[PDB]
């Protein structure tokens, strides 16, 4: 129901052609839809604290997730909520109690100001690779859609060298 973890993320923007080629190299054919419902204050408090708050709806699950700065990478706090809980946070200015609330209070985020600001859809596939999780995302934003490759690892040094070598292996330039 609730988990925390420290995660380090690398990300690279790729063309469709690069994306398809990399998918083919890893036998990625099926993608899973997810929708991210994001929150912020009118003053952008969370962005100011290098942090992000969202409810992810993926298959049957809603997960309230906070990402904040760690000494390196991010401290993630995840809390599975009900559909009714998720709807309530989107409709009204209440955040459910529990671990995410507790972290937001330590961050000194004016919790009552948090408002549901928007949403976006991602078609996602993951594979385990080297020190971590290689993620293939195709996301649909307001104006445009992107292809992205992410790599989530627990060891920064080796994770970074591994991601960079994978990109060079496939002739994909670094685009941050």
Residues forming contacts to its own copies in the complex (CB under 8 A) are 35-36, 38, 40, 42, 44, 47, 52, 115, 117-121, 123, 140-145
Residue 90 sits in the site that holds ligand AMP (CB under 6 A):
yes
9: part of which helix (H) or strand (E)?
Answer: strand 2-14
* Piece of the chain touching ligand AMP by CB under 6 A; list 64-72, 83-91, 98-106, 149-157: 83-91
* Piece of the chain touching ligand AMP by CB under 6 A; list 16-24, 85-93, 132-140, 149-157: 85-93
In angstroms, the CA 82 to CA 60 distance is: 10
CB neighbour list of residue 51: distance below 8 Å, 6 or more residues apart: 66, 67, 68, 69, 107, 109
Residue 37 labelled as part of a binding site: yes
Question: Which of ligand AMP, its own copies, none sits in contact with 47, Cβ below 5 to 8 A by type?
Answer: its own copies
Around 140, how many Cα atoms within 13 Å sit in the side-chain half-sphere?
8
In angstroms, the CA 28 to CA 21 distance is: 10
Annotated binding site for AMP: 37, 57, 87, 91
């Amino acid at each position: 129901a609730m988990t925390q973890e420290i995660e380090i993320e690398f990300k690279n923007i790729v063309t469709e052609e690069e994306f398809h080629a990399l998918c083919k190299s890893f036998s990625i054919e099926v993608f899973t839809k997810q929708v991210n419902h994001y929150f912020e204050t009118p003053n952008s408090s969370l962005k100011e604290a290098g942090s992000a708050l969202r409810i992810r709806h993926k298959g049957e699950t809603y997960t309230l997730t906070l990402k904040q700065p760690a000494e390196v990478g991010l401290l993630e706090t995840h809390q599975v909520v009900t559909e009714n809980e998720a709807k309530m946070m989107m409709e009204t200015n209440v955040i459910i109690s529990g671990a995410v609330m507790n972290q937001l209070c330590k961050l000194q985020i004016p919790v009552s100001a948090l408002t549901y600001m928007g949403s976006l859809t991602t078609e996602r596939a993951e594979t385990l690779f080297e020190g971590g999780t290689l993620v293939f995302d195709h996301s649909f934003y307001y104006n445009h859609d992107d292809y992205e490759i992410e790599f989530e690892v627990q060891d920064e040094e080796t994770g970074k060298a591994a991601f960079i070598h994978l990109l060079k292996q496939h002739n994909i330039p670094i685009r941050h």
